[PDB]
Symmetry: D2
Subunit: 499 residues, 4 copies
């Protein structure tokens, strides 16, 4: 006997033993009489196009794939529910926070960031942690990571970052000179780089890490009053990390470690769960906040902005067909129910457009009609019609223009947005020199102990040594700008690694 | 009050008079608070990204169209059923003929051939008359025309013929020289050309015209015995045609004449029906048939192969959304249930490849998952997976390979094809010189009367006059090769049209 | 002999009389031995898969189409040059206006609006008039119409308007009730509706109509000083219109009338030409302007803002292939070289997203790499990579991220945008009741005469009579609101039209 | 200093040091004035739509990816030439074999089989070795592997064999039960599984394995006489293999080992090359051959059929953009010049369709116009038109139909196929029970030595132990069917592995 994943087929048969197998048909429902030998004119004669059975099956085989995600390609999935435990209705009127005990069906997809579909699960890299809430106000996607911050703070640098984290456009190889040339020319990455090369840079699976909205969002209650908030969802299974040496063994020993961990976990009854907290800032607090409260490379400290609990995330169901229910999942940060809204964070302001845009390309123009993506607890009614692979009635014979004298859908004024006042030149403001070392200083000195600082420099140095020396020298300088001992340790190691 | 097709919204509002209009929502099921005014900064300021209501609608609007059909693009549609009235089980085991009084749902599409989506309905052309039978052995697609014959008899010429019946690649105009240079270089078109320009080139809507499968087909019975056969479905509303004068008036007074006519008829209860017949040829009749019995430019004369009634086609339902139910329909001649099989007709052999091919481009790799295309009265089970826009559970966790020891679907030996013997060189045989005049000469002299022969000549000269003289001179020779007087009448009129 | 268009195939042969015909191949360069007879086991046998020559040709004929344009699908095209005859460098620094005499290649496409690919040219509708300037600073796409104004002034209403002008979702029929239920619930359409049903609704070819930028734009000279402008290009051939009686005849006597007029003119040396003008409004004049200067239903009166001439548009070359050079054309209002910038028009602001979006869907992600959409006089260099149908070298091994220290492209600080100050609430302002009648009243009384007001009212009632009464009574009211005699005339004619 | 592959950017900058960086533009050729910060309303404001610099680049990033090959997805590419060195013109007339010293441009792609784009290069799995010859008569693709044989001999089993070798449809995990339940149910795979699990299952990169065409192919000479042949291209660098112990280390130390090995070689002038032989079997020797001469699971023994050299393949150029030259590379076995034809082999007959079918999906309808796919040593001319992404003239205004009296391309009679005579019932012949052991027993005993038999079993047992007992028992029995000591050694090691 083996682990439950290995026995998947074994159980599918036993869960079926009472029946007779189905008749094997074409895609058009036509029964197949033989599907192991091709129609030819003689035993050693050529193939006929009369063999549509072969063209039916082979044609689809040629169209099985679709494009992989441009980022967070290698992923695991599961399904469960969210349950409200505390009252934050003064902050949000969102139905998903209506009363205590209220449950909502969720979907979750974990992922790394850079590697393609076939890369390993135990590598250094941020981890995706995207959550989709099927509410009666339509879906709510909270597309988080395993970290509260990112490497940049303007969305126009994002593609360049990704290109600098993936393959060289000539050799198709991971290129240290691309990784660090960028990080050292853009020191706002110093915060998330110090998180990445810590121990939690390699989590021992998906169940032993926290999630974070990371973006500042906005909440709107039932009076029309607003506050800014951060979301935290912490692991009730405890932080637990792989060591560099173990992670490396499992990288060839079991490329699908985090995929097997999460499946077996739910299959053996061990349901992983997370605790959803928020931080709250008022609008006023947001004007006195020392840093930019909408700078993604900044955390709101806990002592000033403590964590308010909300509810629990629970994963208790596995997918049944991985493609249909995980690969085709499409999370939109623009999917926001009344009561939740975006902040002016530049990065988030870019993600509002990017995610729906790529889903029409990766999946199709009507990807929201795919079952896992559908807002199946909401009544979708509008004037949108047609498009490739149209799957419902196309809303039947309802008037497809607005406004109209025939009683098609109407707008719901209580769902209007919160009104905020802005003033300033319409112009590109240079955010590359916001504080880039203060919070990082705190992390290095007051969060880590001496052994963790020690490992931090060895993981950095074990990767920056391959860069050219003028890149090294420039990255080191950015580390001394955090704390002179931070850089002069890294440098001591580089001095060795350079022979 | 007006015709019912004009009162569509009127009735739609009436049938909804009681209940309340829906909530207008995004594609994501999020209600919108106002959809007549965009999100801007100030009453005379610019548009924001935040306005995801505008992007969501405008994005889908941008993605309404799909590539029209490459031929037969102007269509009308309707739905109904087929009912068996006579017993033809001694020839075919096809369940759809299992017993008298057994009904099977059908879907139909009437179309022209050459015009684009916005062309007029009352033009000289062949007409589509495609029928889809939703049977228990999977779907059966009888894709025919309003003719028993076609212009050519080898597929490799089909792209060329169509290009010659559409727009010049530089001027993008209808070109007579292209039309008649082909027709006069390929006289096998004499039989269908005669038909086209006579009275039945412009029918009075789609309810006053017959339907034929034109190809020869093979029927197989429960003993494995096989006969060839032709399909005729004759209109129970009577052959009735439009004049050239009345066609050219409606061509601008109501481009959608046919469309309207079918809709109104069904709505008022006036349900059209066709009587399905078959002809039956034995294998040993096929060896002594004077012509090639799979020649698509040939018919089976009635005196030697009489018509055998089978059942009725009946259309009693209008589409609800024309796009989802008529424009996304896909008919594949290769959708044949056990009992019905292809002949060796060179033209049918290419349609076995082409239709599923073009449907994967126009509609999508999983186009058989579109409801009106679904075989919803069979059980689709097989080892095809994935592909863009998957819409069912993708078959669940069922073993996806074959053979297996876990009881995935199995092959049904009774659905094996009938086995014929063939012997001959594997080469390209010349079918340009099979008898191209005999059956036409009969048609011109024995079928048409004096007045019809006169009108057949005028219509040909009326369209053949605009081609160059060397093209008119060759075409008239081919006509003179059918009957001398045929060419003399056409040639007399051309001498006049040429001033 | 016949007109030049009809003789296109004749002239192609003559221009090659001296050469030998090319060798016919597959798409793979493999010469074909026979393409008139299919590969079959014996003369009367089944077709083989080995027959790659059939599949290579039938595969590509199955993929010939693409999605037509969601609007303006029917169009004619030609190529020529824009030449500067006057100096407007004090207003705009654009290199297309640099000095008097400078020529820039252009590509124009004329169009109707609603009719699909096969509709007639001579129908009441607006006419597109798009102009693509190929500048050294990248393309400039002045996507104008044959009118200065439009039917709505908010992009969100745009999908609705269109859907009302096109076909009913259930009957696939032009629906009068959908046309006027819209127009009468949105009386900002009054101004452009009165343009459309007037004599200029049906131009006599594309050479006898003016072209307008319509939108207010922004120009920016070299000192950084900006103004607001309107682009009028007026026909040098004279305004010439068709009568309702002649336009209907041609609609079935030559559905491609304008397509044949544009080609024949050009072929005979009779090149059509336009005169480009600009209006100019200073930032301070805009503030006082009685209407909203960025309202798209409004014009700038000539006495207050008189036409400034700039240069000449000349069309002097027919497309050699219609598909690759006209069908594949793609104009993006967003294509604007330094010196030309958008105004805060709500409709234009929408059109900055719309056009690139749909061109990815209609033609593909790399649609700008089609030769006719190429900026083939500027040097494209950046950090965009890959995509479907990548056709050049893909910018080589160049560093693909920005910033970098390896001397890949750099930004150009002179090419920044003009900075404006805006201040206000971020919200959805209501523009529905901006002055809707004034400039229409002026048009009814002062621009038309006694006859023309008569014809305008017969045209409106001729089409409005088919709507429902409750939709008539409203439209007339909106017409009375322009002038009591306006809607009283319309109401008298409707009284008879309702028997 | 480092290897050449890491100094890629270093040499790019150095190869440009003279000239100045280009101006960073938009896709439209518009210069940008700042591409690091986004257009907002005040420094902490929201993003705008008229930030077309952000949209233009992100929308392309969202579309960087296409579908990955459905098999052989991991690969590495190189370009060089093929040179003739012997005279095989008595067998083939093909232009590539005209005379000694004739060179032709080639392009080669290496690959594994089951891994996706991210997988590792040093794993047990066959190796692709596809070769494209750009000859005057079009392109000649010789799509070979690193083995002479394959696991099956019918194409209707391919999608299933690949399904078993990839990921479970529910767990997305490699599934040894799927692997051996297939292999142990189809024992034809005995021959190739034994090659796979010997030392040549993991080569030391792509420069030390052989290439083979596996399928029997036809040659035809200038007289019209044919023979059946095999293609062998052996490595002039020497067979060299990785041990299970190092192959695993490198599968996490350097996932791209084989790709780096090839590039670094070429970049240092150590060019790899291969020697092209053929075997020859007349038609008479084919009738008496002990097995089926077209059975993909059977080799032709050297002693009866010796190798006949032909020439050399040499790789002396690296790609400049991997994506645009290696990922878009399209090989079609159907690309065959006159002189070379397919043999009746049941598996090759399916590849004649499958590849062009998947290249119209993966890349697009016009994937042959992509530079590296162009038959740029040959002149493409025909009557195929349009299609998505048509990039040249579209063959201009030439006539698009055939035959024509206007001098468009003609057929070339000498390029006709060789006529073979086939006689036999058209049906589905069973090929499961062709001799499944004979040539294997020869390999095991006579080709391997004592050591190599030992490791062959160990490699097999390590992977088979994870499969259920009932699947083990059936596998071993298929290894007892080759040789009792074969299934014995495997059963003694499985006894240990099962504790
Ligand atoms: N005859 C052929 O075309 C080939 C035959 N074989 C195997 O050889 C057996 C006998 O063929 P025969 O020609 O009579 O005897 P030969 O000894 O004449 O052929 C022996 C072949 O074995 C190949 N070989 C050596 N080690 C391995 C390995 N680990 N995995 C795969 N192939 C290997 C060599 O290929 P090289 O030295 O060319 O690299 C050599 O050419 C066949 O049954 C077949 O299994 C294998 C490859 C080609």
């Amino acid at each position: 006997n083996r682990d439950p994943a290995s026995d998947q087929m074994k159980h599918w048969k036993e869960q079926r033993a009472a029946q007779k197998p189905d008749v094997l048909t074409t895609g058009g429902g036509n029964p197949v009489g033989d599907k192991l030998n091709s129609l030819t004119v003689g035993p050693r004669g050529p193939l006929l196009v009369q063999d549509v059975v072969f063209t039916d099956e082979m044609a689809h085989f040629d169209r099985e794939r679709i494009p992989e995600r441009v980022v967070h390609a290698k992923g695991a999935g599961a399904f469960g529910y969210f349950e409200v435990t505390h009252d934050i209705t003064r902050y949000s009127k969102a139905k998903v926070f209506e009363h205590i005990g209220k449950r909502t069906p969720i979907a979750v997809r974990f992922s790394t960031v850079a590697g393609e579909s076939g890369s390993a699960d135990t590598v250094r890299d941020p981890r995706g942690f995207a959550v989709k809430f099927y509410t009666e106000d339509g879906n709510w996607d909270l597309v988080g990571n395993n970290t509260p911050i990112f490497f940049i703070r303007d969305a126009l640098l994002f593609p360049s970052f990704i290109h600098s984290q993936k393959r060289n456009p000539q050799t198709h190889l991971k290129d240290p000179d691309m990784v660090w040339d960028f990080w050292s020319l853009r020191p706002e990455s110093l915060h998330q780089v110090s998180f990445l090369f810590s121990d939690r840079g390699i989590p021992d699976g998906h169940r032993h890490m926290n999630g974070y909205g990371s973006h500042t969002f906005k909440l709107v209650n039932a009076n029309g009053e607003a506050v800014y908030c951060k979301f935290h969802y912490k692991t009730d299974q405890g932080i637990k990390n792989l060591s560099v040496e173990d992670a490396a063994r499992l990288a060839h020993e079991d490329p699908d470690y985090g995929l097997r961990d999460l499946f077996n976990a739910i299959a053996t009854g061990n349901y992983p769960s997370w605790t959803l907290y928020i931080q709250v800032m008022t609008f006023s607090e947001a004007e006195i906040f020392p840093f930019n409260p909408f700078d993604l490379t900044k955390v709101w400290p806990h002592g000033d902005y403590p964590l308010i609990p909300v509810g629990k995330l629970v994963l208790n169901r596995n997918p049944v067909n991985y493609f249909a229910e995980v690969e085709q999942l499409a999370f939109d940060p623009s999917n926001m129910p009344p009561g939740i809204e975006p902040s002016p964070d530049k990065m988030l302001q870019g993600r509002l457009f990017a995610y729906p845009d790529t889903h029409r390309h990766r999946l199709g123009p009507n990807y929201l009609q795919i079952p896992v993506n559908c807002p199946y607890r909401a009544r979708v009614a509008n004037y949108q019609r047609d498009g490739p692979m149209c799957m419902m009635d196309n809303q039947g014979g309802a008037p497809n223009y607005y406004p109209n004298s025939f009683s098609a859908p109407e707008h719901q004024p209580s769902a209007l947005e919160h009104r905020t006042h802005f003033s300033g030149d319409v112009q590109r403001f240079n955010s590359a020199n916001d504080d880039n070392v203060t919070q990082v200083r705190t992390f290095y000195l007051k969060v880590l102990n001496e052994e963790q600082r020690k490992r931090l420099c060895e993981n950095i140095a074990g990767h920056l040594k391959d860069a050219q020396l003028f890149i090294q020298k420039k990255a080191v300088k950015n580390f001394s700008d955090v704390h002179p001992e931070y850089g002069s340790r890294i440098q001591a190691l580089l001095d060795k690694y350079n022979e």
